[PDB]
RNA sequence: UUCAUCUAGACAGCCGGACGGUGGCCAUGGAAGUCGGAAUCCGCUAAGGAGUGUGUAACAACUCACCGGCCGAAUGAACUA
RNA sequence: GUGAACAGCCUCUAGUUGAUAGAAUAAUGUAGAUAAGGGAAGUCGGCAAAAUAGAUCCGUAACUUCGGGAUAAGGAUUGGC
RNA sequence: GUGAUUUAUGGAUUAACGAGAUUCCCACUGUCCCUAUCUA
RNA sequence: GCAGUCAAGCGUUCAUAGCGACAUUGCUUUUUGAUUCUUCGAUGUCGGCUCUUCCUAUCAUACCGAAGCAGAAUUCGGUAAGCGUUGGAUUGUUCACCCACUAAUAGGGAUACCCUACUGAUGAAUGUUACCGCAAUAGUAAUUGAACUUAGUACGAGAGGAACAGUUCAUUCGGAUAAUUGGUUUUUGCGGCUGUCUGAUCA
């Protein structure tokens, strides 16, 4: 028989941060300009999608087929600083950080943990070190230009630009896949206190990796933890413990849309011709509205709603046809998931119901 | 006359359909059977990659002639639209509403006359004569009720399953108005509508169809310039 | 089974057989036993081991015996082929011996396992196990001799040509150094050697051809020497039994020429010796290698032999050769017709007008497809092939047909609104209907109805 | 198998083919947007500078 | 899956374990089936082998002609009585469980059919598509 | 690969000082057979 | 260790020679040095068997084992522990 | 009151409001329930759970110690004004 | 002694009845595929 | 098994005082597959599951060699344990042996709160508090079938007929997810119902 479990994710404990931390990146290619290797946003809900299908040879070629997607809030993302990393015979070593002369209340509120009692003195000496000349800064920058075979940039989100209310910014580091590390840090230095799209990293007809932390479910025992049957000790004998809130990594994820907040009628295919953003009736379920850019990707990401995720651009040069097919949407369901949704727009609600006692 | 193989199946008229003025084809697998048909006929008439509710089976879910065409309730606006865009407007197109949908299974038709179920509805029985100008008859063959499956017709000739007795053969040749033969296809495959297809200037059959079978269908359908 | 025997993979010698079985039973079954384990287990161990060895032995022997054809009452033809070729008595007694050995295997199995429930100790029971295994080994090394014969016949039986006597065939026979191999290779799809020596064809060689949409097989002879008229070697008896058993026609391939191992007078008397084997065979003789001789000038006594061939009811001379096609296919055709000789509804038109068939002008106007031409219609599978394979190519379903305009043929149908998608709306005169309601709202707007 | 040498090198030649070229053009395509975002924010900064 | 079954099968819900009675939609007069077996089976401990639409079985006839009773023969499922998902987006189901009889090759035993057959089996089996009076 | 078990040369006592204790008795048997 | 060969030319390696009655006897439909059984010799010979393998349906052709040449020092077989 | 009732449910007369409490909902337990599709395949084993169950109309076989079996089986019906 | 009836370690038989023991048919259903949820 | 033959060698030295290597011959229940339904004191307590890991002497899955291998598939053998080995029928009993599927359905071994192990969870001390990161080490997972093409290809006389590549689905396993569908109800949210209590409605 098989074993009622895997063995790879074996120390089934909770992770240490809700930010699932990037561990891998595709290595480099020092011929291109710089391309950001990752991005991050906040998962919001699911929808259903039909899609006409250019899949040569498949049974469903040139047919409509319904599939199911998710959605994530993807505001613009501002850069605040960089770090270098050098190869050793130990591994890698953080040797310098540098920050960007003016920092948001959000990230100042991240590094502090009890905000309002704080004097909010986070970088007041660093901005003073940003002198008339920036001498020490350029000292500790050109160092990295010399050293630091590979380099990362810090980001933070603009979370006030979401329906969510947490007030706090989720830092991260992001690796680059350009060359000319001097050019990398020069590019980033120009990008200091400057923000970046998600259609400026990704596009359609793309595959991604989705790394996040799962929904928690508490201390569920064997019968629902491992799907094991019901009536010294070894470490693979299917004993009860914590489920959920593990980190995971989900790959081979076909994007269909790279949305846009300013673009009205985000739910518009070529077919619908209806001025509706994808935010369906009722708001999202435990998430609010989508008045920003977004992504529509098939399958189902690890997470729960109003949870953060991190994105990576598939980490290698894929080989399957499905990694290269050309997407064409036909219709977005835009109904409320707060019930068995029937109607896309409240004007359609008015139209099919008619006028009512409260209407006049 | 040519034998032809769908993907590994010898039954053609379940996966494709023919008329004198056009031809239909499924999209299962790779684009080789369409090339097979156009190798014989070419651009003399439109040959159209078509589907029915995403199904491969047009050859038995459809019935028509060079004057008009019919499709059952299950087909979709997209396929209907594509049929009119592909085909010239000289030929009719129409979507039918019935209880049952096995149109090519239950219609063996040529350009002037066609046969149908006994229990088929009189509304569509009127409508088919309205759209095709053909004389309609509600009969069976040796008690075998599916008419569009076990018969293949043309204006040159026709064919029926082999179990038909000779009294049935003659009294049906009366109704059908071509010479008939109680014949076979692919070493005795009873299902002749799918085992082969025929119009006034071509026949198509599976690879298993033998040389006596080719000879009798060639004679009865009078297909070469010396028959 | 009739007309082919291929599902007999091999028969190994006795030493290979025992090595294979004993290795299999050392491998599969357990091997580790101590004394301190219990006596139920120690008996069960050796019992399972000997049972598995007998299982392997009989499982081999059933594939041996059932693989073989059991020639008795399969066909007189093939049975006589085996009689001339494969040493019938050796065959039957060998298979009977190994079947007896299978019974011996079962007997020693049942006797030992009848004993072994009373196994008491290792110096008794281990030796009992060795005793049973060596006894069946004694049967195996008793049965060494026939197995090489069985193998060498099995090598030949799979590579036999296959001819069913009940069907139409063409029994073509010619002399040694006659040109029958060249003739057969010209007429038929057949690989037979063309070096002009006597015993070139060694067995019943088959060649296929077509006539009147019928299949026909050509059975060649290795040559015959009937000088005792009772006994001939195993090569010569094969075609003899073929001419005896195969219920079909016979074609005599005559060569009245000096390029033979014997004179021409031997040919006619050989014909006379084989005369009684032409009972219902509808014989047809043909002369070959005739371009060099041109026998119209042939002498009076040899012409008298030619007439003296002709007392039997069915006989027919023809002349052909091995450089021209027309006469050889002619004699082939009428030989097939000799073998044949030995072997729908009406409309009534129920109408006043004729239903003529519709065949438009363009199907006749178009050219029949050329397989190879430098420029021709493209057979768009081959268009697909030169850009991607036959599975990977997406094809535009648009831009392959006629419309009012091909510019917007690639246009996207909207096909959808907020609700009530458009194909239930779509027809012409929709602007006319819009005006037909524009006038209506123009009526009702001014009447104060929408107060 | 996933990790057989035959399927692997047969996939490596194809990866060296169309797929990596699609990605190499995609990265320039997206570098265009990645660089013009700076121009959009900088002309916004010019609207601040005036 | 076996021979005759042109095209592949896409995953559908599974309603028919072994010992599941169903109707016989044929024109031979046979009335019912009792499944014993599946061809195209999965391998797992303690499982009940499942059949579904498009699948091909071995099974008996518990009621029908007596010459065919007390004998085993193949069959194809034609009606599922359980909800499935065609990718062209809809859930659906027929009411009753039914399976028709046919040779191991895929050729239909009887010459005709009563009642609806699913799109899946219709698309799959051409002899079903030729002998069938109905589709869905 | 999966490089297989190595059998010991440890003390592992049966063999060593008690079995050819009996094999000293086997030398006794050698003397007993040498009379013939 | 014991047998053997050896500058009166050791062994390796290259080349040639490797003949008759003979295609020896019946065997055979064909079997000639070798599908095969019996036998198995003599002339010349430096040497050459009624002929180890290659293989033709037969023949045929090729090689060593048997000898001589061209190079020149050691070398081979069996057995032991 | 209910209904066949002294079953069970609710209530008036009368009498307790005693049984260590509080905050939290993680599993698993203990008692109690529901689950599509199939319907005893599972299992030594229809163990347990579940099915009809009340009242009327018709009807209820063989077998018998003729007394029964018999609420046999099995079908229909059941509200309010 | 033995335990109703027909016809004495007691023989053939037997309607009803038994918290007596065994096989099978109907429907019934989480016993199971295949587990899920809710309540004190 | 027993009894010879052949007999490398051994024996104060040795055929013959005597052993003995490997093969061979002796029937051991029947020379023409006709069969024979032979289960002939199974005398022990395990049997049957939940379910983990290990061994290979591999049953398929890998790659290979040779076999009359023309092909398909098979017969053996080699490295190979990475991954897999089923649903039923029958006895208190493991003894005994069938049906069908699948690629195969190989063989083996190993009361319980108490301290330990296992599954999970906090945690002061490192001058503090916080953020981002490195990754010594440890574990590791994917599997198999079928199919369009190649291709009715070469090969074969034909019956037959794979292939490599390109391409799509599916099985068994694992991990996520709640769009949708179906299941679940103390939302006791909304209606409805029987008996009864607050005179009746209402609630």
Quick summary:
Chain B is 26% helix and 17% strand. Chain B is an alpha/beta fold and 227 residues long.
Structural class of chain E: mainly beta
Q: What share of residues are in beta strands of chain D?
A: under 5%
Q: What percentage of residues of chain D falls in helices of 4 or more residues? A: over 70%
The greatest inter-chain interface is formed by: B-C, 54 and 40 residues
How far is the first residue's CA from the last residue's CA of chain E?
23 Å
Q: Could you state the CATH homologous superfamily of chain E?
A: Ribosomal protein L14/L23
PDB class: ribosome
Keywords: Biogenesis, Large subunit
Entry title: pre-60S State NE2 (TAP-Flag-Nop53)
Chain A: 60S ribosomal protein L3
What do you see in this structure?
Chain A has 360 residues and is of the alpha+beta class. Chain A is 12% helix and 25% strand. In chain A, strand 3 and strand 4 (92-99) form a beta hairpin. In chain C, 44% of the residues lie in helices and 7% in strands. Chain E is mainly β. Chain E has one domain: Ribosomal protein L14/L23 (Ribosomal Protein L14), CATH 2.40.150. Chain E has helices spanning 119-124, 126-131; strands at residues 21-23, 32-35, 56-60, 72-79, 84-86, 90-92, 98-101. The longest helix of chain E has 6 residues, at 119-124. In chain E, 43% of the residues are buried. Chain F is mainly α and 36 residues long. At the B-C interface, helix 1, helix 2, helix 5 and helix 7 of B face helix 12 and helix 13 of C. The structure holds 4 RNA strands.
What keywords describe this structure?
part of a larger assembly; 6 chains; E: 136 residues; mainly beta; Ribosomal Protein L14; 5-stranded antiparallel beta sheet; two-stranded antiparallel sheet; 2 helices; 9% helix; 22% strand; globular; F: 36 residues; 1 helix; 56% helix; elongated; ribosome; pre-60S; Biogenesis; LSU; Large subunit
